[PDB]
């Protein structure tokens, strides 16, 4: 996932360059795992909104004949209704009337009475086919973008068959199902998938649009730098690569624009980069600021102030907090016996 911030591993050189040489990172996760191909496909998700506790409808037969007796009672002592729970994970049935609380098979089950015993498609129709785009490097699929554009990588993804449908559980916990994902692990059953509600969709689309807005703001900055033949140091904060990877770093030193090749490593908490108020951790030791300028728009504060990255923006992090809080896993029923 998109980190909160990206810090260079270590600054090596500072070679002054021309301003037109600037180029916005265009940061993508597809091309960061080495997947520049992108194909359109149709995957499967849970039905939108709270989709759990299937509550299967059935009847009890008191001693194929039981189906004739039930159809006759609609228009052997049939006792109905006998609504039972279903764990969608293994197509499991749940009720204390079952011997030890669980019946798992496949069209008929048992009961705590040997004289009275207890379709399966309508209750298990809990999926929507939706449109997505998978990133490919030839045959390999690095990851996919869902319907509302959020990119999930398959690194850390397992296999998990919800309600008799082969699918995969992503690293964050969502569940999709498409043809040939090339997954190998199989997902210890204590791992859970998440709800698919419309708030999830809205917040995801908001993070998508926030990222595209990042790149468009960068492009606007460069477009102004060209027709202005001048560049403000704080505007350099727009040219940071948002994801970890090999990129460039920029600074305005000695009155000129300088760049360097550098490796961006993750920053998901502010405290790591500035443990000591005054210090900015680049590598092992803190690096020295000069003349009221650090790099990438980070400033030495004029007076009684300290290294100030653009931590005032805080709009992507807001929507990612809203996303991380608004997810809820789908747990199993309770097993109740006698």
Curated annotation (Swiss-Prot):
Question: To what use is this protein put?
Answer: Primary surface antigen capable of inducing and reacting with virus-neutralizing antibodies. Almost all human and veterinary vaccines are based on the functional aspects of the G protein.
Which residues does the entry place in the Virion surface compartment? 1-338
Spell out where the chain is glycosylated. Answer: 137, 254
Q: Which organism is it from?
A: Mokola virus (MOKV)
Q: List the subcellular locations.
A: Virion membrane
Q: What is its main location?
A: virion
Work out whether the entry's keyword set contains Acetylation.
no
User: What's the name of the protein?
Assistant: Glycoprotein
Function summary: Attaches the virus to host cellular receptor, inducing endocytosis of the virion. In the endosome, the acidic pH induces conformational changes in the glycoprotein trimer, which trigger fusion between virus and cell membrane. There is convincing in vitro evidence that the muscular form of the nicotinic acetylcholine receptor (nAChR), the neuronal cell adhesion molecule (NCAM), and the p75 neurotrophin receptor (p75NTR) bind glycoprotein and thereby facilitate rabies virus entry into cells.
Q: How is it modified after translation?
A: Glycosylated and palmitoylated by host. Glycosylation is crucial for glycoprotein export at the cell surface.
Q: What are the alphabetically sorted keywords of the record?
A: Glycoprotein, Lipoprotein, Membrane, Palmitate, Signal, Transmembrane, Transmembrane helix, Viral envelope protein, Virion
Q: Name one GO cellular component term.
A: viral envelope
């Amino acid at each position: 996932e998109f980190p909160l911030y990206t810090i260079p591993e270590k600054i090596e050189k500072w070679t002054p360059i021309d301003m037109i040489h600037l180029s916005c990172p265009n940061n993508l996760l597809s091309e960061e795992e080495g997947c520049n191909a992108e194909s359109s496909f149709t995957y499967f998700e849970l039905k939108s909104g709270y989709l759990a506790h299937q509550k299967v409808p059935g009847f009890t037969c008191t001693g194929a004949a039981c189906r004739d007796a039930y159809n006759w009672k609609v228009s052997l002592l049939i006792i109905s209704p006998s609504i039972v729970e279903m764990d969608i994970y293994g197509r499991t049935l749940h009720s204390p009337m079952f011997p030890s609380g669980v019946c798992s098979n496949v069209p008929s089950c048992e009961t705590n009475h040997d004289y009275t015993l207890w379709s399966l498609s309508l209750v298990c129709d809990i999926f929507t086919s939706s449109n997505g785009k998978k990133a490919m490097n030839g045959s390999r699929i690095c990851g996919f973008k869902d319907e509302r554009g959020f990119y999930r990588s398959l690194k850390g993804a397992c296999k998990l068959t919800l309600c008799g449908r082969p699918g995969i559980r992503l690293f964050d916990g969502t569940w999709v199902s498409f043809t040939k994902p090339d997954v190998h692990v199989w997902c210890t059953p204590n791992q859970l998938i998440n709800i698919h509600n419309d708030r999830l969709d809205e917040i995801e689309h908001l993070i998508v649009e926030d990222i595209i807005k990042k790149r468009e703001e960068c492009l606007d900055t460069l477009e102004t730098i060209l027709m202005s033949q001048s560049v403000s140091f704080r505007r350099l904060s727009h040219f940071r690569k948002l994801v970890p990877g090999y990129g460039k770093a920029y600074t305005i030193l000695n009155g000129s624009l300088m760049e360097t090749n550098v490796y961006y490593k993750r920053v998901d908490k502010w405290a790591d980069i500035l443990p000591s108020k005054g210090c900015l951790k680049v590598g092992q030791q803190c690096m020295e600021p000069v003349k009221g300028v650090l790099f990438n728009g980070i400033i030495k504060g004029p007076d009684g102030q300290i290294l100030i990255p653009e931590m005032q923006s805080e709009q992507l992090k807001q929507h990612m907090d809203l996303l991380k809080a608004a997810v809820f896993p789908l747990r199993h029923p309770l097993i109740s016996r006698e």
